[PDB]
Design a protein around this nucleic acid. Structure first.
Lengths: 437, 437, 437, 437
RNA sequence: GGCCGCGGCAGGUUCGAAUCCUGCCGCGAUCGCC
RNA sequence: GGCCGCGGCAGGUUCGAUCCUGCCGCGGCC
RNA sequence: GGCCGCGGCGCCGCGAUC
């Protein structure tokens, strides 16, 4: 019902209120006062500094600017001292390098040390790019803050905001570049309908061209792809989302979807209708950050999926879920059970030695010749995908990711049938099988 | 035990007794009397003329020569007419060209018209080579007829004698060429152990060499392969047989093996242990010669096998049988049941026109994106190999051979489970599954 | 004396003599006989099959051609089986697939299994590319075999033939492509003088252009760089060698260089005069193949080099050496000894709290202010590069390569002075320091 | 069935048939005529001369009796000449002394030259004792030939007949002495039940004593033990077999046992259940006689076993097998994996010089004092028995037997897991793990 | 010839060997043994 | 006459072409 | 199997090379 009215109502869901702004302003003023006491060079960067952060996601980023002369150690020591002295309650977090996360008057704050550089050519670390990113945007994004907020809220409600591995979606910095390029949320959406997996957007040169992959050229560093970790599938989803929006605009595009929580009985009747084998590999979650866990959950799923393909259980899709205590690898297979007998390949009839060897082994049934080479009927170790995976996870745990694999070595179990519907994975199941609400 | 005594004992199971010879002599000289009255050019050829026919398989071949001053049409008229006016209880058989077949004083006889040719260059038809074959062998095979009979007996015992499509084995002409080449039965068996699927035996040039296929060069025409209809798997079986015989010689090799009759309950218990689906397509046998029938049964069997692979029922082997009234196509699949749901591939996400068309269809489940393409869960019309073949044979009867397919069109039934073991196909089922005695 | 006369004398050094060719032919014949006996499809490939192999380096490569339907497991099983059967004193090696290395009539052979492909697009495997490399070259290289041999000998004599990691030079395939491109060894050398680190040679297209890296396009796959593992410095050395050859042609360019082998006393005096700290980290060689060992020796020596840079010992160069039992990482530093006392950075003067903490630590000497920042004199844990490396190798063994690092972790020792000159590293030290003959 | 009838039945499996006697008798009488014409001093001895040879194991032993004047290599080459001019198809053989082996009219013959001695005082080698052994037995054994053959067959059916190193059991001569001592086969078995590892059987003195070891005094030489190469464990096995036989007599004791047939999968499941490390050392078999090979395989096994004990992998049992081309050294260990860290013992605390040296070695962790003594943590060079054996076999190949060790030096593999069950060692693995079915 | 058991000499391992393992020699045994 | 192989034509299948079908001549096989 | 580069926050994952 009228795009302009929808976008107007969508701002309410995204723009922070007076209270949250005032909460940030008071923390900012206190933060600067404490920093100025220490005589350190610093700069406020990121979403807060440009006023492009979402309602409910207030977080202040302060970058400490140190001379190029400093060592990495000196960069760390000094930085860790400034951070502790300036925050009410601090915590040492780790990324490319250590830094300090904490709180100032109720507001979350990151204090990150980096080098003060003259040109982007000296950029070695990623934290060294962040100040240049801010410098490039601070003037170009003015007046277009709410457009950024619309784009972010849009992506967030559809589960593709954030470039972290859990999402493999759009980074905040990517959104702001898109707004600078197209000028508004609506124009971004309109043009995105024609994006391909070979689209190259170059804000600095002000042009769109064709490349080898979907590439958003960092105006600060032409060799960097800002959308590097945006998956092909999430790109496709954004493009299709944009087509749907212009076709029939709705405020519902900006509203987070409520997961499908159906009764285990309806779920049982669905699986019965589909006639598939549905089961899960449950194991204890490794104590590691999301950015290590989720690529490993992806790897473990893929390996078991490929195994299921090789063993002729014909997997349809896989999925996974991480809770606080347990992880789950979910699978659906077209084959509930396969015959015990299978065909074992032998040598060609010409090979006297190896045929003799092949026929020497005792078997329940007689080998045979087909198309000039020997074959033998032999017996499978397992005849259901559940037991197949039980065997694979037992013996090939080392291939299911470093930490995920090691955990599966210590403990795992196969859960199938209606017992699986008791586990907290019904939402992932319904999504996996494409269940309509 | 030893070879020398084995072959001596084998000659008894191989050489026609004086009673069988006398039966043939009295039919020959009488048949010549009728060819002299009419005063027509004739010649006795084949296994009878060369005295190399195997015991029990007495059959006289008489070719009617006619001048080159005749068209392809004129030959059959005065050909068959001389045939009918010479044979007592005659009929008409169809293989290549029309010819007469009838019994004269006990034994059956075949009268084939053909041209009288000077050199083997004016050879248009295949029956034009038969005189030259006989003329090439009649001198060279003298003194080696028992060696020929041993090889024929050895082959007929193990179901690979005869080049007709029912057998796809060794022709009688091929057998005699091999004996002339190797000098004896024992030397043929000894050397054949080293035959490969690319061995070339050039009889006239007295050399073996490597080629593109198993090729026995016809002395009369170097471009012809005497072993053309000898299948690859029957070659393999002969090589393997020859190896086993030299290793542990026995008269049993010259005696046909037991029919192997298994009771329906042990057969049921076997199928259970294998865990496979076993079923048959039953239809009424077309009234055609075996050389037309068996290639069509092979085709129908293959087409259904390929359908089963394509539909992911994972067939193991197939076979077929033809009784007097019915034909059977036998199959064994590793999949008894597949899921109702399956994946249908859609267009890539950039392709808006086709994505819209792909998503417009109503389905029970939500389509999804994967690796840049759309995919849809859809439903199979059948979930068992039996039900799949019911559908296939019903709508694709036409491609199951000209006559076999037409019969299947008029009537067929799928027979599975215990009810199949009542059908007269137990021998073929046991062979197919490699059931050992 | 003339360029062409030298090339004529050089042919004697690179062309295989009659005896070696005969040794190859007879091995080939016996190998073909063994393979044909087994019925397998195969193809001779590589330098031997194309007659471009270098004098004294006779080696036969045979690829077993399997159908695409074979699984990897079947491919590997049938491959190894055939390899073990046709080769004497065989040996199982491990590349992409395990393959069989062995001997046939005194000649070394590789039997490698691969897929028989129709189009090069089905290639995701390096061994699958080899048959296509052969088909592309077998015709185009005819009449140019001696030119390839000239180029290989030129490269080998100067230690840059072979793309394996020990060499990081030119592969045989690359050499042959270059000869096809330029037509001769002389033209290749003449044009190579103008090569740069951005040169792109497109062989199939017969053009040269500029790119991001030195890139020789594989005619079978335009995405592949045939010179991928040619190091930058070895490219540089070849270009320089080419300029030198054309300037003053000599047969010496084709002759291997003999090691220096100077007396330990002379080497000692050279190091004394240079006034440098020269030492080695000695540890046991891991039982791994060259292609894993050498990249790890490169990493380890590089990591220790960087440590020495950080610790202000001012390294000049590093080198390494692998013997059968031991490995050596060699270093030369401009600093033999650094002062005990050093400068420790403190906080800026404004920071009252951290200054206090900084000044509260007990020290032998008083802290001081310089450029608005507090500093303190503190003591180094080590004062020689030998002891620094001793510490670093002890505590950071994990960064010196997985296998090399694990070895050093178990045992290493720092050798220097007269003890070092007794170790078998004289050649490497001389080269490292640029000692003239 | 009574014992008497079982023994009556057993004779059938044990006495050579009339054709075998006529074969040997004709070969004998013919072998004499050739020896008499030359006018050479000869004597028939051994199991044939006394008619005690077991069914199927016919061998004619002829000894050439030469004067004492011809020393060593004088009669060695002369007797060898006589051996050729009497045998049909001969061949030379070694084993502690030289001789000639061949055939005479299908029967196998040995021709061993030796000294003609007055009394058993002039004894030099074992070849000089044989005629005296024969002389001592030829009269006493008369009428008890079948008792000897029962004992021989009994032992052979249980793999403990023969003194050769592959067996380490009862020699034929020992068997005869035992029958002469106890009178019959049945009395030997009854009394053997009470044999201990200190039983001394003195035939010449007709008594049993208690001594230091199992000792059967040779009636020809009181100093030598006829049961010298009978192992303690085969003595044990025989005594246990005799107890079993008298408790529940059976003809089965005279029939050899078929090896245990077992699926690789069951074997994998077994090793999983046991939780042990099971692996083999595979290498090419040296071309040497059994009497040299097997003692070397025993030595190699023992050495590696002792290495495994020392390195705390806690081996259970070992075994070995020789195939046609390869040997296998099998091991089962209770430790699949051991920690990298271990304790190294240092000097006593008061020993200042040695403490200083011990502590001078740089190490990852701090040394410590325990019970008046210094200790340090250090790192193993391997953490699995597989890694350990690979290292040990590489460095200490020389000690693993003369020929066996040299072969290992050239090449060996370590095979474990499921790959090992493909090797022809399943019977041995079943035996050493005590697998029953 | 190979293996087995003792005596002698030379190495390796070690902070340090009469002893812990490798090698070269002498004397017996087994197939001292075979 | 059937089967197999090789070419051209017209339809099914699919979101749309890879894949199944039918029709005509060429070569092999019984 | 190891090495190099990319990605996300030194640890993981993915590409290139042998």
């Amino acid at each position: 019902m009228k795009v302009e009215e929808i976008l107007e109502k969508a701002l309410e869901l995204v723009i922070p209120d007076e209270e949250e702004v005032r909460k940030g302003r008071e923390a900012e003023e206190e933060l600067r006062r404490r920093l100025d006491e220490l005589g350190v060079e610093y700069v406020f960067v990121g979403s807060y500094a440009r006023n492009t952060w979402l309602k409910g996601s207030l977080e202040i980023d302060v970058f400490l600017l140190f001379p190029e002369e400093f060592s990495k150690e000196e960069l760390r020591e000094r930085g860790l001292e400034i951070g502790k002295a300036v925050l009410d309650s601090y915590e040492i977090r780790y990324a490319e390098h250590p830094y300090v996360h904490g709180v100032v008057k109720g507001v979350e704050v990151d204090v990150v040390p980096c080098y003060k550089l003259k040109e982007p050519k000296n950029i070695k670390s990623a934290v060294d790019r962040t100040p240049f990113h801010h410098k490039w945007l601070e003037g170009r994004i003015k007046g277009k803050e709410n457009e950024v907020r619309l784009l972010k809220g849009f992506l967030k409600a559809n589960g593709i905001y954030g470039a972290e591995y859990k999402v493999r979606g759009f980074s905040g910095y990517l959104c702001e570049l898109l707004i600078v390029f197209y000028g508004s949320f609506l124009e971004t959406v309109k043009n995105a309908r024609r994006w391909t997996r070979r689209t190259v957007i170059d804000v600095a040169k002000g042009e769109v061209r064709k490349g080898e992959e979907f590439f958003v050229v960092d105006p600060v560093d032409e060799k960097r792809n800002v959308a590097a970790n945006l998956s092909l599938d999430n790109l496709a989803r954004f493009v299709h989302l944009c087509r749907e929006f212009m076709e029939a605009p709705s405020l519902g595009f900006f509203k987070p979807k409520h997961p499908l929580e159906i009764e285990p009985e309806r779920l049982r009747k669905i699986v019965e209708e589909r006639g598939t084998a549905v089961f899960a590999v449950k194991f204890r979650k490794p104590d590691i950050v999301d950015d290590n866990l989720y690529p490993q959950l992806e790897r473990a799923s893929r390996k078991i999926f490929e195994f299921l393909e090789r063993e002729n259980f014909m997997p349809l899709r896989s999925a996974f879920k991480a809770s606080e205590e347990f992880c789950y690898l979910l699978f659906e297979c077209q084959i509930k059970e396969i015959s015990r007998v299978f065909r074992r390949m032998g040598p060609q009839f010409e090979d006297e030695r190896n045929v003799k060897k092949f026929l020497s082994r005792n078997r329940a049934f007689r080998p045979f010749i087909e198309n000039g080479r020997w074959w033998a009927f032999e017996m499978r170790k397992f005849t259901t995908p559940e037991e197949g995976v039980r065997s694979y996870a037992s013996t090939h745990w080392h291939t299911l990711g470093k930490n995920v694999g090691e955990s599966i070595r210590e403990y795992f179990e196969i859960i199938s049938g209606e017992k699986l519907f008791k586990e907290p994975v019904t939402a992932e199941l319904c999504e996996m099988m494409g269940v309509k609400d």
